[model samples]
Target: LDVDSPAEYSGPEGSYFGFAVDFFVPSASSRMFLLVGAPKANTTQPGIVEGGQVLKCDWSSTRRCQPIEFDATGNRDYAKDDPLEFKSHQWFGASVRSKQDKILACAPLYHWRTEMKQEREPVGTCFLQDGTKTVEYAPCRSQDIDADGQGFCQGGFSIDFTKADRVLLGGPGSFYWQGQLISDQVAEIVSKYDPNVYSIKYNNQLATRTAQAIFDDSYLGYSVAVGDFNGDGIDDFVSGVPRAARTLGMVYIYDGKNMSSLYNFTGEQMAAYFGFSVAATDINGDDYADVFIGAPLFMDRGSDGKLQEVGQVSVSLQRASGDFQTTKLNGFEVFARFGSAIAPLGDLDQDGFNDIAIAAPYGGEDKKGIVYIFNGRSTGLNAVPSQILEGQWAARSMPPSFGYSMKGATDIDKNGYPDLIVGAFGVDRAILYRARPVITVNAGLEVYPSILNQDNKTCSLPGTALKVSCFNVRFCLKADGKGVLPRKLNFQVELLLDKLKQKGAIRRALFLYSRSPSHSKNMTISRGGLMQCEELIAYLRESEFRDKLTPITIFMEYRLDYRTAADTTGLQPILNQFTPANISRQAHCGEDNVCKPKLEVSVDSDQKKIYIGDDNPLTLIVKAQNQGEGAYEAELIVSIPLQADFIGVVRNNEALARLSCAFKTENQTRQVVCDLGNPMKAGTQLLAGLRFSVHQQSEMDTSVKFDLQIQSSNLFDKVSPVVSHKVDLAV
Candidate 1:
């Protein structure tokens, strides 16, 4: 099976075979195998209906699954005439877990009846198979069914096996539904009761011990996991109580040696169901294990301040002091239930750090489900997923709920990389073969002449004397060869300037040769060879552009070229998002380069009285001069009364080539601005005529007024503003 394609294994339509799944490897077995649970399948026995079963499937190209018939109906002899009380539909294969050559399956709904009474107690049972031997362990059989104080102990609500060959069983129905965890030595259960067993010094831990009896329905044994949390070589046990602490959820850890209490973690939000799923693994390669808990009902707040039920996972990294530092992982869609399942793969990318997989069974518009793969880094785990496996990968139009259950971390193909298994309860189970080994890319980008002085006209446009300001940018890329590095890697580099400008506004800078604001290039690189350095020149259009206040942002990004590669395992190069750098604009002023311009402005009109019909147009003479250092982007503005409309500008001499004028109506007032000079030099004077016409004089208008003001990019100094000239009008 190739990594890019999904390998599927199906069972009978109504069997519900994929309710639970696990990779299996028997002692000295030639072929790789897996175990699947069909908790609602019918049994061959005449009296049994809807009796669950487990199927062992060969993990290969061809799909072949065989049902495993457990002794669900033990030595209980029932009379044919009085068969009202029978053992059927016990949900035999509700859960399956395997470690090395040992396999464990459970039927939490199994009922146990005593010879004394007809009432059957739902005291669950489990089957443990080691190599060629199979044994059944039913710990709750010793309970007194008729006793007034006896609580229901459904032993197999959840199950797991530690590295030391110990068995862990979760009984959520124990103690008035408060839940309990039973930890027992596998050797003791095998040696003491080889066939049917009862409680024999099983280390039982209660989910809660609070005096507030309202917590009786915490349901602590809903989930269970084990790991080397303290880096002590010995493993630790963990359990989840999804309904604990006012429905906020909680998880508890205990020592594996003596079953002593280690810690208790509480969920942050109410009704989040935080402990619905629990896992512990060495994600950071620190030897000390970290904890991951799922809260499928968690709601996340978006940037718009709207809350959605996207669900989240809590990660607690264990420190050298055995304490934990907490963080969070979230899903992007509403009602995704992302934490429905969690699996850990030990160094799947071969980068020393371990990886993790999270499933969202209710994700996607079709509700087909989605699985996200997060690769571990030296710092911790990546916030974004490296790979996303969806339910549609199976290529079937079947019912949804694809990620109902999952199991991974085992190298089933023996390809030096771990694989993953997903359970879609509606149809079949799928396996994803990891194809591509991951590579880390080290990239660098730098821009020379980081500060551009607009006044320095060093560079000239090709075939023209129009000198302008310019800068240089360079880029270099290489690959890290820590593990499974490719011979040659293909990548792409993109460059952008003035990336933060307002939408639809012209950019401040452009590439020299192309005169464009952006550039892109595809490149090939190697691990040991000399890296190729790419360089480009960019220039600033200082004459036309005026906003020298904000910096020009140069953004550079490199992405791995993955579409052309044809690897069997689908290995890809990994990279990170780079932050954009800023380039400032320099002004030529004094020693400090900060300009403080002193401007003088005056306005006058020839006619003190105006006849509306005869003197229809009124003209004003405006003058402005910069007395201090050069003023960048200098302009002279004139405010005309509402009774008048601005006409074209008038200048006497033709040598005022640098002068330009424009008029615009703002807030019902006509204001005309004249560009004196881009950078008006000190002691330079600009004189121009601004004319206006009164088209339709209003009855309320008696006099017309005009005001002149001078301004520049440097707003530090100023003379008196609002130089006014008024004239009386006769309608």
Candidate 2:
């Protein structure tokens, strides 16, 4: 059986159906002719196929051929004089299978001839099964060498079934230019066994090569991603044109086939884009993928504390608009504008919504850098700035900066709190900040006292000396010699009482002692060495006895000093120095009334593992018990590297295991429940994980690393396991 057919088929116009036929030995068959009609007359003598029978002819000059079977009885059948005739369109080819079940045919056709011309006609291949033909067109060429023609052909395309989890159609260098096909030659080099090799069609046409071409000539840029921008199920493309001057820092929205300009920002706006380098994420938790452009200059931290527009900078969220116009926030005044590298959308604050993180290395005054966190608030499309951190506040002496970079806010430590990881290009560092919770208390003192005293009768000479005691302490008093004798003494006594009330009761007091008692000028009080005094009495009453005099007590109040250095010994000093005296009972007044101890939580691991495409649950073995007397609920957070993807929480019996009552007093250990179910690809790496708890608006942060062992069950299917070695989960 000869399966190879001529390049063309020619014969009369007619449809002829026949069953299986076989030729016998010693018998010669007459030459057969078959013809198919062609609308365009590009070639003369019409394409012909040899050794085929024309069953019938029609007025349109179209004819169908019957299935021919030949039995080679002898060598004579192979001799010359054997005539065969078949006719088809101008350009076509055929292939036959010897096996009884395999029947195949191929033909090439010219689809476009204008801008794209080909040297040969396009070919199509097919397999016959159950009277139906499954066909694939072969790679075709331009009919006219000078004209640029682009169409699908069979020769260059391949199918890879072995590693066929996904079909990768485009490569790093492949691109389409105008109405012409360019860089598609790579498709011809791929093999059929490469599972990722999928049939690719050049759909996006390159509009320009320079910034001026994009601005003045409407040149479209490089990459694109499909995602919903308006809560609509239909996917949209967030595309960028790095070379297009007009769209240089612009991100366009393409809803399937239709394209629209979303928004455009200044060159500084585009410099902050980075990684893969552009993507669409619901950064504001608006259920729409905000446009992101990745620029290499994103981390430059320009001289003006902004991104310096330079190099292949990317712009993200440059513009957004949709039915839910409120969801499309404005893209101006973003962290990383023009010269950025990578940017991502996430809920950094755990506000149940997504926010934008612009990695601008050139964002600080000295270009040291900072990650501008723009909280997502609904205000049309413009984002409102809520909070900012620099230097120590950001936990870095040099602010983390990035140019055209990737970043994430996650609970990597499994502390149930989100931390930050910035790929700072300017610093050439991947910086991470673990969340730390802090608590503060303001303390003050108030004092009140009761004094036991009674009327006292005394022979008043010049002044009477009285003693007073407070808080088990004594004070001495003296009368001022001025003005009216009795009135002055009474006024001086009252003044002493007031002073004692303002300041704490005097610890010591003095009484004048002199060798000459007759003269008051000879007697004087010493500067040092004094007796303890309690209170003061102003008048002497006739009805009361001198022994009945009771010391008047003074109440003293003050504010407590709660500020403590990192190395402070304990809270006692902080309490004692600030507590007020003579307030009820000093013992009854305790520090617990004002300040309470704080609890801290942490985790320990060797490394963390995450899957590539799938979100995996990670079990965080953590210490969750409280360290303070006040009851507290610890928050568990897991933080992964920027390259890692978080899947979900893992459920395990170990996490449910709590400390027994016997071990409650001691440092008890409990297993944290989690799962690592994500299927990560080959290139992922582990960073760290964090654990933290919040108390009274304060947060405590700790971290750990679990060793990772990545293994694939199938060559194309794999999962990563992050296991902690000798883990200790204690509070």
Candidate 3:
């Protein structure tokens, strides 16, 4: 229900939702591309930007940010702009930082071509991409236009984060030269688009890795994924050449830095757009990231044995020998285009592994869109879809497109389960559906005084048997909401007990009753649910009702268990009353609990002469593990010497964010924190790290032992002895 955070950007009456076309977190500083190819946003409106915007915040609170905008608004600033933004439909995040210190982010435009015209200012962004260079500051790798008339090229890029020197991108568009031209000319122009995704050294005109000789018009590198698919310790890059084989898309894996082709596989389907979306992740939680491929236009057979073009996912399981075995995952719906957008939503169900979210935005009822959640716990592709999100309950719209674009598995509220950030281009707004708790209060069955027993009046003989067992009758009762998944819930429920209490002691001729015990009961709303309960089922006696009461009345009280706001059909009580129950799991209704994302500290095998002396900035890189139950979003709050300037963050070895005291900064000790994105998937793995720096200052006090305490947001407060070992600076 927290459809808040005011997604910071705009063009007033513009399509702001889709502006966040594609976003990737480069540590604490997040960058989103405005790629649905929206026309330039209102330059007329103040702060109305139109380009890639970088954001920083706790997946905790999606706040207003002073984003860095790369404005390549018009065709005039193609080669001269500092940010290198263009109308080529860009998406590259080349980390131009010191040793992966938080990439300054390098991305690409989809249709960046040399012959594509924007105006009289001349040619497209890739006009000089002809590969003939030797310069540190030249972005365009001097390439001449070899088009007979015009040519089309699609650009998709992948960054080699391990090196600060280069980024790789592809050129796959071609033009025809028939009639007066020979077949060789057609081949020449296509070949000129260059080797599929040639590697361009940082700020240099010449491509370091000569282009792969490809002229078959196979759209190689249209989809690129970078990850450590093999446990070789080095991150690898994969390219999706959807048109690689007679319309049968193929994926090629490379040992990133070396540019060596490691493996290549394909979805044998011809023309099905098999390699539409490509991704790699630890699908089975085996530590080794596996290959995840999608074919949005794929054809799959439903359970009914009927073959329909419903899209699909293919996995190349990571093998022990730096290899893979392919497995095909089935899909749901007709022409849904499920794989058009697929992203890794970190361990969503609190399961120890990481999960993937596949969107079929154009496939729901009335084409409203939906995303299918495939369980990450299973292996070998015979996997079943765990949850399917229909934006109905989570998003605010009607024309569908709820999950058209998925940016992440970032946890905003910090309640262990990582949340999914989805966008709705149809309605133009972004919404979030958290893995927060959900529920209804439980109220059990009524007994003797209830309808189960032949109805109505039963007043005990006032003086007859006040001490008899007849007056001691009690019934079994229970209450709970068991719909959602299991998570510790703290909610309030309205419990309406059938009032059959005996009023005044024995003074009256007749009396009948039942008393619900106070303070303690076999039940309370906090129980996980009815089945996985954390509550109880205790008895109720007829003695405790005070005299001034009506023995026969509808008695109601509230108890607690759940997220957002729970409102639904009024559950009928054992006493036969329809009380519409709102899903308020907390006793204090609507009060957002403080999110507590925790992490553990560890030093990986990479060990050199670890030292923190003077002159040189002190640095410590350690793995931050999650000791808590569920995978949650967390931040590294550090209390460094006030003199040191915080320089971003690194997660999973890649710089996840550029350092800022983004979320919070205390001038006292100059505490800076980074809301590390991606939940520390709820298991044991070296998937985390912390790297910080200290400024060398002459006025600094040297030699005093101090600690840079790394901590969580709230209650996951177990302190570690090595909460960052002490390093005294030299005078």
Q: lDDT per residue, candidate 3, 1-731, as tens digits?
A: 12332232222233333423333343334442222212223332232244333232222234332333433244323344332223332332211111212223333342232323332211122221112221111132224223322233322232222322233444333221110100111112233343333223332222213233443556555656667754566666676777765678787777654556678785667878877777777778778778778887777566798768887777777877866777776557787787877778766655467878888877877667888877665556427676676755323444546676665555544444556666665565455555543233444323232211111125343445533222222322234433333333333433323333446233211123233432233232234334422332223232222131223233334444223233231111111123433211111001233223345665332222223443344445545556553333344555555555555555444642333335355554555555443344455444333344454454545442334444432334433334545555543
Please, what are the lDDT tens digits per residue for candidate 1 over residues 531-642? 7788888888755655555667777777677654434445443443232332223222776555667888877775667776553777777767888877877787788776
**Please, what is the whole-model Cα lDDT of each candidate in the order they appear?**
0.73, 0.29, 0.45
Error of 3 at 321 (Å): 3.3
Per-model TM against the reference:
0.69, 0.29, 0.49
Q: Once superposed on the true structure, which residue ranges of model 3 sit more than 4 Å away at CA? A: 1-67, 72-140, 144-171, 174-215, 301-307, 323-325, 378-382, 391-401, 437-560, 563-731
**CA lDDT, candidate 1, residue 263:** 91
Ranking by lDDT: 1, 3, 2
Residue-pair clashes per candidate: 5, 153, 58
**Lowest-sum lDDT 10-residue window in model 3:** 177-186
Task: Give the winner by TM-score.
Answer: 1
